[PDB]
């Protein structure tokens, strides 16, 4: 054939892929973490947005730290051969490098490591997108007038 370029990911597999949305709104009383009012609007907006991009959206609400890890492990062990990409959206409280389950923290590296190129073969070479609504510390940006 004619000249070929390889500058964009192949996005015409049979399926665009999964979009896993973890929507943590209510936290166990013993943690003292306040409920995240407004997060259901985000989870609904994301579901609609990714549905129109033809992702298979799976919404999960109020998962413990153990459930988050188990969900990620199980998803990483599916056969993604016929999927172009993978998306995970995390909506929770957080700190730098950490997202909260309803009963305590999960290191973001633990979640993303399941999808490493050597650990999720059917996603090797395919874009893996993690969208994270959570704090990354306690600094405040005062802004500057333009």
């Amino acid at each position: 054939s004619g000249i070929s370029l390889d500058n964009s990911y192949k996005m015409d597999y049979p399926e665009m892929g999964l979009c896993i949305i973890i929507n943590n709104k209510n936290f166990h009383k013993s943690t003292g973490m306040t409920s995240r009012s407004g997060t259901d609007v985000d989870a609904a907006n994301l579901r609609e947005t990714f549905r129109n991009l033809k992702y298979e959206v799976r919404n999960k609400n109020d998962l413990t730290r153990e459930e988050i890890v188990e969900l990620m492990r199980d998803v990483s062990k599916e056969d993604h051969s016929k999927r172009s990409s993978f998306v995970c959206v995390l909506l929770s409280h957080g700190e730098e490098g950490i997202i909260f389950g309803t009963n305590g923290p999960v290191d973001l590296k633990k979640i993303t490591n399941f999808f490493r190129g050597d650990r999720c073969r059917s996603l090797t070479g395919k874009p893996k997108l993690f969208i994270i609504q959570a704090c990354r510390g306690t600094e405040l940006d005062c802004g500057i007038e333009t």
Binding site: S8, G38, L91, Q133, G137, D141
Partner: protein, 104 residues
């Protein structure tokens, strides 16, 4: 030649092909409105709805950065938390351009 290029057996990094679309810069709070949702997710959805059939993903996320940065500012009865701003943070380990659409 050289010792560290032109390998006979091709590998890629195990950390390649990841993209982390963080709602805020490292070290910072991330803001959420109790009625409308988080500033970042509101803006990300709006830009994907408008531009996913038109722009490469990094360029969509750059519009999300501009929308969050310019259109939102916190309102709080607590002066400590009032009038604050936010910039999201795109962290790309991707190796190719990403378009949500393809040629038919």
């Amino acid at each position: 030649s050289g010792v560290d290029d032109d390998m006979a057996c091709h590998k890629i990094p195990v950390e390649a092909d990841f993209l982390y679309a963080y709602s805020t810069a490292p070290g910072y709070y991330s803001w959420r409105n109790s009625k409308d949702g988080s500033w970042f997710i509101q803006s990300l959805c709006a830009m994907l709805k408008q531009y996913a059939d038109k722009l490469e993903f990094m360029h969509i996320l750059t519009r999300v950065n501009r929308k969050v940065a310019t259109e939102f500012e916190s309102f709080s009865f607590d002066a400590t938390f009032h009038a604050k701003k936010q910039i999201p943070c795109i962290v790309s380990m991707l190796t190719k351009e990403l378009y949500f659409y393809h040629l038919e």
